[PDB]
Amino acid sequence: AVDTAEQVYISSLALLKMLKHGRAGVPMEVMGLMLGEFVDDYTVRVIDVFAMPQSGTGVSVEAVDPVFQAKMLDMLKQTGRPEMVVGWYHSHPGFGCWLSGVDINTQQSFEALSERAVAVVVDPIQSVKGKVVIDAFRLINANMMVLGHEPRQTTSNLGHLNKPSIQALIHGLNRHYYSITINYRKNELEQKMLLNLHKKSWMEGLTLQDYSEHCKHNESVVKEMLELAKNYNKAVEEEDKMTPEQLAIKNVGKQDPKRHLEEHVDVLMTSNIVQCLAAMLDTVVFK
Amino acid sequence: EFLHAQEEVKRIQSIPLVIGQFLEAVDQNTAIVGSTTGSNYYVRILSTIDRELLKPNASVALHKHSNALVDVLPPEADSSIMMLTSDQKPDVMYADIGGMDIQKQEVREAVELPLTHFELYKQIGIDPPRGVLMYGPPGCGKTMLAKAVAHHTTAAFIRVVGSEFVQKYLGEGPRMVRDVFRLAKENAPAIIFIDEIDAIATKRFDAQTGADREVQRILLELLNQMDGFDQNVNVKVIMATNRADTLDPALLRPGRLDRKIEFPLPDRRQKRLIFSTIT
Amino acid sequence: QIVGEVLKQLTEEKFIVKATNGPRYVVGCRRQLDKSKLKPGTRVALDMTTLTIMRYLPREVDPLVYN
Amino acid sequence: DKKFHGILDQGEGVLIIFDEPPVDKTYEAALETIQNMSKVVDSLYNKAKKLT
Amino acid sequence: YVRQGALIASALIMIQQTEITCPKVNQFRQLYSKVINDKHDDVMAKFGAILAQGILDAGGHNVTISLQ
Amino acid sequence: TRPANHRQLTFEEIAKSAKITVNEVELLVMKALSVGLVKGSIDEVDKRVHMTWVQPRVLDLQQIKGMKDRLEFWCTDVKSMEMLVEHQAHDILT
Amino acid sequence: LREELQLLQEQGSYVGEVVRAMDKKKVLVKVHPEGKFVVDVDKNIDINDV
Amino acid sequence: AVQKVVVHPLVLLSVVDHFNRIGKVGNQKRVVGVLLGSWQKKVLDVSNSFAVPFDEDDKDDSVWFLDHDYLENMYGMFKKVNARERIVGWYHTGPKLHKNDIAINELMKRYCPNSVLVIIDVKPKDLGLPTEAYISVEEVHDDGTPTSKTFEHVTSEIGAEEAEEVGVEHLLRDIKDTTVGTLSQRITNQVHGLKGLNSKLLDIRSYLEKVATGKLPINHQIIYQLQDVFNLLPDVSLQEFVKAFYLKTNDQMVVVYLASLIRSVVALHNLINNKIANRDAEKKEG
Ligand SMILES: Nc1ncnc2c1ncn2[C@@H]1O[C@H](COP(=O)(O)OP(=O)(O)O)[C@@H](O)[C@H]1O
């Protein structure tokens, strides 16, 4: 009955398995279990996670086949590294950071089996460009609410960036006990390997591309900045003698001086000089 | 670092957008939009796009799962097809018509507003006509006046087609009227030509049968748009009908639509003239 | 894939595809397909989730009476 | 009338036909941008605010 | 957490000093009183506010924490 | 041997290389283009043959010093220009 | 602005035509897709503010 | 037989972690397993990985063992959860390849006809190479040369897996390996592009020097066939710059007129506006 500001050291490959499994079964609400171990009460670490096909029945405990799970665990023990089952994950396209009724029921069964069996919500469709949602919580018995509620223990760590969603708040999960803090095993020999090797552009900075599409691009650039000419024109005759900020607020035009700022012209200038320098560097290399 | 941060935060995605038409910009950082499936919903407007293309009732773009104001689509005609810019194309010029006149003097009167003369509408003190209803059968073609005139004085020509308009896109019917009206207002030389009003579009003697209320609401928004026009520009609107009896009084009353022209049968003398012209 | 119609081509990158039953979206096109194969007002298939053009399909109409 | 692309070299009694590259309209467009983005702004603004 | 940290810092600057140093001293003390009496604030903000009040009135204008 | 260093294959140079007459040069360079020896332009006002080869063969590995020297010349030029632009760019890269 | 896009990712807000303002911070409202959706009142606006 | 292979940014770190977790007791330095994926359009991709403990002896490189029943059960489970995934090849660490690879390929090719080998450098990060691909071709070394093994490298490029951009951005969130800060970022792009070009071409020069010394066997039959054209390609003729003296110099001079001047004018407008405001404030403050 002790749940402090717990933190999950989730692994990058566990993330990749999650996104691949969700991307495959987007509309099936595919299920899986998060292979982690309680090295202590709250510093839970997950190094691996597996993908399991949801049975036709749907979200059921028998859909996660016990014999198949046991054989998979034995295979991991023989090849790889063994790891305990103290959690689960589920692509949840329907709604957000909370659990459905059947998800709560199967998580209750997992809690009866395991010690915590954290309830993890990962939305595959909401994660598009920058925000992937991995929210973990615990189901509680009726005694936690009748005692001093908010099982969040006495510390100032789980209150950092703790913004449960409205649907999580109206549901019991993410409200029964607490919301678990997340952490990423960005260890070196792993993170340096990823940044050095995966995002690879090493001899691709030597591209010349003087005028492959750039003659017509310069035509478009001149046309766009001719529009800027009209805009910056329009501005200089607006230019009223009544504190022009007063005129500007009620007559925004998003012109060259205001919104189409010098940054865009700098982008055009950088593109030109980059092609210039690349062409000139290879010209002097041409010896 | 802050230049790097400023140029890093300027990603704004905006690739997989969806379309849900804007209603109006109530203020800055607040707005109200109406999606394609309806679901009118107040939203927050980002500062990236603003009045430059934030015209009141034009179809805009929204993000896939977010419905947020991201972009406004400039074109309006091809949103629901319903014909397009028939201008800049001589199909049937003018005097080459076989119907001679029928009257064609009220039609040249109707083209006076496209033929400039809005300045001459003032000073002299006249009030030029705004609507022209032609309650004639397919005699005289009833569209050889609109395919012409639009080329006699270079002006946009739109078929509209009333029969196509009455369909499942009844909720988007108001939006498409706004879009086609905006297309007209964009080009002061433009004439709206609506067809097949009598049988389908707001018959007034047979009771409302299901989607008839939807047609009445669509017509009502058409009245709203034609009253919002209020002679702001020199664009003209002409409906062509076989029988004006079933038409709604709201369009029929003066102040919205005044000039009623009947285009009768071939008129045997004129019929022989038509035969000579076509042959 | 969900079936829609090319409501508007918009541009070479983004296209307007309207589902047969309401919403229209500003989507991308299939990499293997080209605009000459897509065309305006032709039946196409959008990805169910990512909402992008996947394949274009021909359509037919039938009077199915007294044929 | 610009229907042909050549120059009549009467001294040699010939006409030198040249293939004119028309992709150089960026030049004229750039000049138009220079004219209508500088003349309309610099003289008007800094003659209105002569004193600063 | 920044709000509660600012409250703690403003209390720490205001320990052992009265309104003679700055007229804002009484304003901040009544601000601390009204935010500690305001129980609809966030858990972290309220926590820092109460710790701010405690360090401000540490010992009853009797003891102080000074680096000098 | 000459990576476009001597890209002017004049008639006299062809005569030195092949001890062939002037009329046979046309057929020889024709067959050279057909097989793939030289694929460049063939003039006759100056009789200049442009140099592109797309059918490599044995380069006398005992004489690999020549291509090694040309490759190290390219290395020295590339590194020297990289250092030169670095010298011009210390105001941003330092 | 990005968070506004993420808020809008749940449609943002929903337009409602307010009709009945009940005393217990309750407004009946009407939403074009469905219609009436009885709901509470926001904190920035009182019961009488409706 | 495949034209080329493309490696995802999806299995590289998984292989490295598998090396790390099974190297705790197995210090053979030799991690051998299978890479699963898909081959559709002469482009082979890898989507999953698996490691098996593996011991070697230097005696003729024929001492080894695996858990084939467990590995086959893994493959059945992976195909059951995702049918499109199939074993595209088998991978071994230790880029210094030994001789058991032929026996391993012969045994595993019953899962994949075009059996391929993959080497992952867990500890090495030489310039940017995460892994290398190998294709087995024993169909005569060359036209006039004796028999050999001759495992060639099929061209490999790091692919762009979908939906992993969110995770990698959240993971790093510190370097921002994107074109942000366009001018400085492209300067860095030019910098390591020159670094890579100098390093690789120096390596080619060293290889030519070592071929000249003859201490190593000479694979000239492809070296000169591929490098002669490289050397003779006429990128040194400058008369095409003479024909294109205004290659873009017209665009250079319009940008000077229309980017640097425009920046100067807008900065001037900001300053004179600020000067007017400051002068008015100073005169009308009291
Ligand atoms: N010179 C002409 N004079 C009159 N009618 C013509 C001439 N040339 C063609 N037409 C006919 O006029 C017809 C227009 O018919 P339609 O638009 O269907 O009638 P309505 O406008 O009443 O629906 C065309 O089908 C065309 O055959």
**D46 vs H272: CB contact, 8 Å cut-off?**
yes
For H136, residues 6+ apart whose C-beta sits below 8 A from its C-beta are H102, H105, H115, H116, H117, H151
Residue B239 Cα to ligand 1 midpoint, Å, equals 15
Whether the Cβ atoms of residue B250 and residue B223 lie closer than 8 Å to each other: yes
Check if C2 contacts B (Cβ < 8 Å): no
Distance H87 CA to ligand 1 centre (A): 69
- For A213-259, where are the E strands, in sequence order? none
Answer whether A255's CB lies under 8 Å from A231's CB: yes
Measured between CA atoms, how close is B220 to chain G, in angstroms? 18
What is the separation of C-alpha C24 from the centre of its chain, rounded to a whole number of angstroms? Answer: 10
Q: Measured between CB atoms, does H259 come within 8 Å of chain D?
A: no
Instruction: Indicate if ligand 1 lies below 6 Å from the C-beta of B162.
Output: no
Rounded to an integer, what distance in angstroms lies between the CA atom of residue A59 and that of residue A105? Answer: 10
Full DSSP string of A153-167: -S-SSTTTT----HH
Give CB contacts under 8 A, 24+ apart, made by H210-215. Answer: H211/F61, H211/F64, H212/F64, H212/F65, H212/F68
State the DSSP code for C14: -
Sheet holding B236-241, edge to edge: B156-158, B190-194, B236-241, B131-135, B259-261
Mutual angle of helices F65-88 and A262-285, in 10-degree steps: 150
Whether residue B73 contacts residue C58, with contact meaning beta carbons closer than 8 Å, is answered with no
The answer to whether A134 and A10 are in contact (CB under 8 A) is yes
- Do residue H202 and residue F65 have CB atoms under 8 angstroms apart? no
Phi, psi of H152 (to 5 degrees): -90, 160
CA distance A88 to A114: 11
Are H96 and H48 in contact by the 8 Å Cβ rule? The answer is no
Q: How far is CA A156 from the centre of its chain?
A: 25
H contact residues 156-215, partner F, Cβ 8 Å cutoff: 184, 187, 190-191, 194, 197-198, 201-202, 204-205, 208-209, 211-212
Euclidean distance between CA atoms H153 and H156, whole angstroms: 8
Determine the residue type at G2. Answer: R
* Structural resolution in Å: 3.6
Interface contact A241, partner E, CB < 8 A: no
Cα B263 to Cα B155: distance, rounded to the nearest angstrom? 23
CA distance H112 to H104: 12
Separation in Å, CA of G1 to nearest CA in chain A: 14
Q: Is the CB of B274 under 6 A from ligand 1?
A: yes
Closest-CA residue of G relative to B23 is: G15
3-state secondary structure of A21: helix
The alpha carbon of residue A181 and the mean position of all alpha carbons in its chain are separated, in whole angstroms, by 14
Contact: G9, A130; criterion CB under 8 Å? no
Distance CA D18, CA C65 (A): 68
> What are phi and psi for residue B187, nearest 5 degrees?
-120, 95
Q: Is B195 in the pocket of ligand 1 (CB under 6 A)?
A: yes
CA-based nearest residue to A41, from A12, A15, A8, A10: A8
B48-63 per-residue burial string, b: 16 or more CB within 10 A, e: under 16: ebbeeebbebbbbbbb
CB B237 within 8 A of CB B111: no
Q: In whole angstroms, what is the distance from residue H267 CA to residue A262 CA?
A: 9
> What six digits make up the tokens of A263?
């940054």
Nearest beta carbon to residue B41 from set G1, G9, G11? G11
CB proximity under 8 Å: B 54-93 to C: 61, 64, 71, 73, 75, 78-79, 81
Consecutive H or E run containing D16: strand D14-17
Question: Which among H38, H153, H135 has a CA at the least distance from the CA of H86?
Answer: H38
Q: Cα separation of H230 and H225, whole Å?
A: 9
Residues A158, A179 contacting (CB under 8 angstroms)? yes
Burial H69-100 (b: 16+ CB within 10 A, else e): ebbebbbebbeebbeebbbbbbbbbbeeeeeb
Residues in chain A: 287
| Residue in this structure with the two tokens 């490691």, named with its chain if needed | H51
Q: What is the dihedral of CA F72, F77, F82, F85, to 10 degrees?
A: 170
- Other CB atoms within a 10 A radius of the CB of residue D45 amount to 16
| Residue A64 vs residues A33, A67, E61, H81: alpha-carbon distances, Å | 9, 9, 65, 12
Closest CA relative to residue A256, chosen from H217, G6, H185, H267: H267
Copy the structure tokens of residue H137.
């071709």
> Given H16, H182, H235, which is nearest A190 (Cβ)?
H16
CA distance B19 to B59: 7
Distance B144 CA to ligand 1 centre (A): 6
Smallest Cα–Cα separation from B22: which of B2, B52, B46, B42? B42
Query: H44 near H71, Cβ under 8 Å?
Result: no
How many angstroms separate the CA atoms of A74 and H69, rounded?
11
Residue B20 marked in a binding site: no
E in contact with H (at least 3 C-beta pairs within 8 A): no
CB under 8 Å, gap of 24 or more: what pairs does A48-52 form?
A: A48/A11, A48/A13, A48/A14, A48/A17, A48/A76, A48/A80, A48/A81, A48/A83, A49/A11, A49/A14, A49/A17, A49/A18, A49/A89, A50/A17, A51/A17, A51/A20, A51/A21, A51/A24, A51/H81, A51/H82, A52/H81
Q: How far does chain H reach from its first CA to its final CA, in angstroms? A: 87
Domain ranges of chain A: 7-195, 206-280
Measuring from atom 6 of ligand 1, which residue has the nearest CA?
B141
Mutual angle of helices B173-186 and B212-229, in 10-degree steps: 20
Q: Which residue has the tokens 């004049």?
A: F10
Sheet holding A118-122, edge to edge: A31-32, A87-90, A118-122, A134-137
C-beta separation of B263 from B97 below 8 A? no
Which of C26, C41, C52 is nearest residue B18 as measured by Cβ atoms? C26
* Alpha carbon distance H88, H45 (integer Å): 8
- First-to-final CA distance of chain D: 53
- Strands B60-63 and A181-184 turn out to be unpaired
Say if residue B141 carries a ligand binding annotation. yes
Which tokens is A183 given? 């952490």
A246: burial class by Cβ within 10 Å (0-12, 13-18, 19+)? exposed
Who contacts E54 (Cβ-Cβ below 8 Å, separation ≥6)? none
* Rounded CA separation A95/A93 (Å): 6
- Centre a 10 Å sphere on the Cβ of residue B74 and count the other Cβ atoms it contains: 12
Q: Over chain B, what HEC string results?
A: CHHHHHHHCCCCCCCCEEEEEEEEEEECCEEEEEECCEEEEEECECCCCCCCCCCCCCCEEEECCCCCEEEECCCCHHHCCCCCCCCCCCCCCCCCCCCCCCCCHHHHHHHHCCCCCHHHHCCCCCCCCCEEEEECCCCCCCCHHHHCCCCCCCCEEECCCHHHHCCCCCCCHHHHHHHHHHHHHHCCCEEEEECCHHHHCCCCCCCCCCCHHHHHHHHHHHHHHHHHHCCCCCCEEEEEECCCCCCCHHHHCCCCCCEEECCCCCCHHHHHHHHHHHC
Rounded to 10 deg, the angle between the E43-56 and E2-13 helix axes is: 10
Q: Is the CB of B140 under 6 A from ligand 1?
A: yes
Which amino acid is present at C22? G
Q: Which chains touch A (3 or more CB pairs under 8 A)?
A: B, C, D, E, F, G, H
* Of B223, B233, B228, B234, nearest in space to B257 by CA: B223
Q: Give the 3-state secondary structure of residue H53.
A: coil
Helix, coil or strand: residue C9:
coil
* Max Cα distance, chain B (Å): 86
Contact E50, E35 (CB under 8 A): no
Q: What is the DSSP letter of A108?
A: H
Closest by CA to B259, choosing from B95, B45, B94, B108, is: B108
State the chains in contact with B (3 or more Cβ–Cβ pairs under 8 Å): A, C, G, H
**Which ligand 1 atom is the nearest neighbour of the CA of B278?**
1
Question: Ligand 1: does its nearest atom lie under 6 Å from the Cβ of B141?
Answer: yes
How many beta carbons lie within 10 A of that of residue A190, not counting itself? 19
State the amino acid at position H214 in one-letter form: G
Distance set, CA A16 to CA A96, A181, H8, H10 (Å) = 20, 19, 11, 7
- Secondary element (H or E) of residue A134: strand A134-137
Distance CA A4, CA A6 (A): 5
Cβ(B145) to ligand 1 under 6 A? no
> Rounded CA gap, E30 and E9, in Å?
16
Distance CA(F8)–CA(F24), nearest Å, equals 18
Task: Say whether B37 counts as a known binding-site residue.
Answer: no
Residues of B with Cβ-Cβ distance to C27 under 8 angstroms:
16
Q: Do F59 and H228 touch (CB under 8 A)?
A: yes
φ, ψ at A195 (rounded to 5°): -70, -35
B143 labelled binding-site residue: yes
Cβ within 8 Å, pair B63-G5: yes
Residue to mutate, B96, B144, B195, B263, ligand 1, most ligand atoms under 8 Å from C-beta: B144
Surface-to-core class of residue H203, CB atoms within 10 Å of its CB (0-12 exposed, 13-18 middle, 19+ buried): exposed
Complete DSSP assignment for H101-158: HHHHHHHHTTT-SS-EEEEE-SS--SSS--EEEEEE--S-SSTTS-----EE---EEE
**For A62-77, what is the HEC assignment?**
CCCCHHHHHHHHHHHH
Secondary structure (DSSP) of chain F:
--SSTT----HHHHHHHH---SHHHHHHHHHHHHHTS--S-B-SSS--B-----------GGGTHHHHHHHHHHHHHHHHHHHHHHHHTHHHH-
For ligand 1, the distance from its centroid to the CA atom of residue A188, given in whole angstroms, is 80
Tell me the technique behind this structure: cryo-EM
Contact B34 CB / ligand 1 (< 6 Å): no
Asked if residue B98 has its Cβ within 6 Å of ligand 1, the reply is yes
Neighbours of chain H (3+ CB pairs under 8 A): A, B, D, F
Question: Which residues of chain B are within 8 Å of residue C22 when distances are taken between CB atoms?
Answer: 36-37
- E strands in E18-66: none
Residue A81 corresponds to which tokens in the numbers above?
């590294």
Residue nearest to atom 19 of ligand 1 (CA): B138
Q: Do E47 and A156 touch (CB under 8 A)?
A: yes
Does chain G reach chain B with at least 3 CB pairs under 8 Å?
yes
* Contact between B43 and B36 (Cβ < 8 Å): no
CA of B139 to the centre of ligand 1 (A): 7
Nearest ligand 1 atom to alpha carbon B263: 22
Angle, vertex CA B60, rays to CA B59 and CA B61, nearest 5 = 140
- The answer to whether residues B132 and B238 touch, using CB atoms and an 8 Å cutoff, is yes
**Cα A177-A179-A184 angle, rounded to 5 deg:** 140
* C neighbour chains, 3+ CB pairs within 8 Å: A, B
Any residues with CB less than 8 A from the CB of B109 and at least 6 apart, and which?
B129, B259
SS3 A102: helix
Q: Measure the N-to-C terminal CA separation of chain E; round to a whole number of Å.
A: 28
Cα→Cα distances H203→E22, F68, H108, Å: 72, 12, 35
